[PDB]
Amino acid sequence: HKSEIAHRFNDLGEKHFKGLVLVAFSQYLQQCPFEDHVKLVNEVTEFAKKCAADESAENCDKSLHTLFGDKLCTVATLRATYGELADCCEKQEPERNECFLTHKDDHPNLPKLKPEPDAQCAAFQEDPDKFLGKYLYEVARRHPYFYGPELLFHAEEYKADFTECCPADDKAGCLIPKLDALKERILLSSAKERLKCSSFQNFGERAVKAWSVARLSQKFPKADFAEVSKIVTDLTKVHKECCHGDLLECADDRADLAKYICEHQDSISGKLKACCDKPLLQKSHCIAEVKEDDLPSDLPALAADFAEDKEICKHYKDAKDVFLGTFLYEYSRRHPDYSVSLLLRIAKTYEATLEKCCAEADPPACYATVFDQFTPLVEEPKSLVKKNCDLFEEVGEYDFQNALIVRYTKKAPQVSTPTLVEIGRTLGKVGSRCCKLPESERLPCSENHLALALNRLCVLHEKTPVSEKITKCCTDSLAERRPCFSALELDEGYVPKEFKAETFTFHADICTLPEDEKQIKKQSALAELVKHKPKATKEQLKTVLGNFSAFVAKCCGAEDKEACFAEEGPKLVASSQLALA
Ligand SMILES: C[C@H](C(=O)O)c1ccc(C(=O)c2cccs2)cc1
């Protein structure tokens, strides 16, 4: 097709097309006003029409990028708002996108989205086309790497929830429990995808594909290796393009892969029938979040092929990754109770065992026990979520977050306090989700989500490196990240942060904050206590945070709030230093 833009226009349909365009734009330029973005969509949407009707027209034959980054450059206020971003335009393709992507902001500090059960149905009954378009703008900008097509699906979750209850009697009774749940689902999905792009960008395709083979195997244990290799190829391609901004090609390829899975669902999984009865974006969303299919009764003994087989080694020399992928698919198949990372770790301990036993040794008798050189690999993460869910159930989420903040702040006290507080709080939320689960579901729940939070840390740390040791965890190896982080401990050369009184001076302003905001204030206080007394025990810190918390609550109910803070503040600070000896 000589017009790649026409081709995508006819394939995708105007809405989704324009929808993917707004999102493409809200991601590349994140603090441009909304109707500013809207305009840009039309100017490209319009061009696609001329080609859809006549491909031979000039400029219809050029790359989507060409025809998109061109549109970015022309816009006004791009330099005075985004700065360095404006520099990328002298560049050409392929480097222009390269450069643009660089300047996507993973920590934008734009203000929260407040759920307004009265005041926001104003735009709902007013105009759908700008209430959905708003939300897509509003989420794309706070998540520059969000899975392009999954967003259009969330938007229609947004649409349908006001539907059920905007003029309804008890407004925020039906609504706010929904938008809240949703808010969560966005952040998780954003974290899942950020990790897919983070892996392309740090470790290349080979890492994404092993991850997928592992994960689709667990999901579709009934499919066979060539069904799975097939889907993994198409699916990796789809995410490679999404992470590179080519949303249009990303969505088209996604539709085709949904179409494929649905046509062959009978040899993939019986969990797919429900997905396959749906409209497009629901169908794609549904496939991507499908539950793991039941294991097949005929599952063969792993032992023969990979333990008791007489000749495993020529297979290697000739079939390098191909043979490994086989192991990975067969192991992952019957272990829905392992995290993806644990599986890749085992698969590295086959490409490991197999090098020793076969080459420069006599294979069959020493590797006939390889399956037990994994039980250490398994016991470790099991003990770990054991401890941490014991701790969690014992003390609860806020105090679990507090512990992780302390734990992580000793590991890397050089990291800024907002980041420490974010990872601490994110890790604690994992505890909520993953510890209640049947205890065969919590290792994969926990460690898979741990992968997301850690990757978030690593992305922040990519923006502002402060510790060579973090850098080693984030970049040495994908499969080993969590182990690496578990190994960090307080640097014995660390010099405690010089004590700053201002840093624990509270005022009556903290009384108006919503509670999530009060907690962060406290939890930051907590990181800062650690950064200044890094050797204090978790038990001591708990006491001192107890006292700061009582002091806040007390004074926030005082008549002279501010003279309360004035008079009690400093006493506490002096008394706190002695307590943290
Ligand atoms: C990597 C870090 C560590 O131990 O250094 C860590 C390891 C494991 C966990 C952990 O198991 C959980 C948090 C929430 C539910 S389970 C939390 C943090």
Distance 305 CA to ligand 1 centre (A): 35
Contacts of 559 (CB under 8 A, 6+ apart): none
| Dist. CA 20–CA 17, nearest whole Å | 5
Domain 201-289 is in which class?
A: mainly alpha
Distance 421 CA to ligand 1 centre (A): 15
Angle in degrees, CA 136, 141, 142, rounded to 5? 110
HSE-up (13 A, CA, CB side) for residue 223: 29
Judge whether 201-289 and 380-487 match in fold.
yes
Helix (H) or strand (E) holding 437: none
Domain spanning 4-103: CATH 1.10.246.10 = yes
Domain spanning 302-379: CATH 1.10.510.10 = no
HSE-up (13 A, CA, CB side) for residue 499: 9
Distance 385 CA to ligand 1 centre (A): 7
* Residue 94 preceded by cis peptide, ω within 30: yes
DSSP class of residue 83 equals G
| Dist. CA 111–CA 517, nearest whole Å | 12
Angle in degrees, CA 406, 410, 411, rounded to 5? 115
The answer to whether 428 and 404 are in contact (CB under 8 A) is yes
Angle in degrees, CA 579, 580, 581, rounded to 5? 95
Nearest alpha carbon to residue 576 among 544, 542, 551, 530: 544
The atom of ligand 1 lying closest to the CA of 385 is 11
Nearest CA, atom 3, ligand 1 = 486
Binding positions for Cu cation are: 1
The torsion region of residue 15 among left (phi > 0), alpha (psi -120 to 50) and beta comes to alpha
Experimental method: X-ray
Binding positions for Zn(2+) are: 65, 244, 246, 256
Domain 380-487 is in which class?
A: mainly alpha
| Dist. CA 23–CA 9, nearest whole Å | 16
Resolution in A: 2.5
The number of beta carbons lying within 10 Å of the beta carbon of residue 209 is: 19
Report the interhelical angle of 375-395 vs 397-411 (nearest 10°): 130
* Pocket, ligand 1, Cβ cutoff 6 A: 384-385, 388-389, 404, 427, 430-431, 434-435, 446, 450, 482, 485-486
Nearest CA, atom 11, ligand 1 = 385
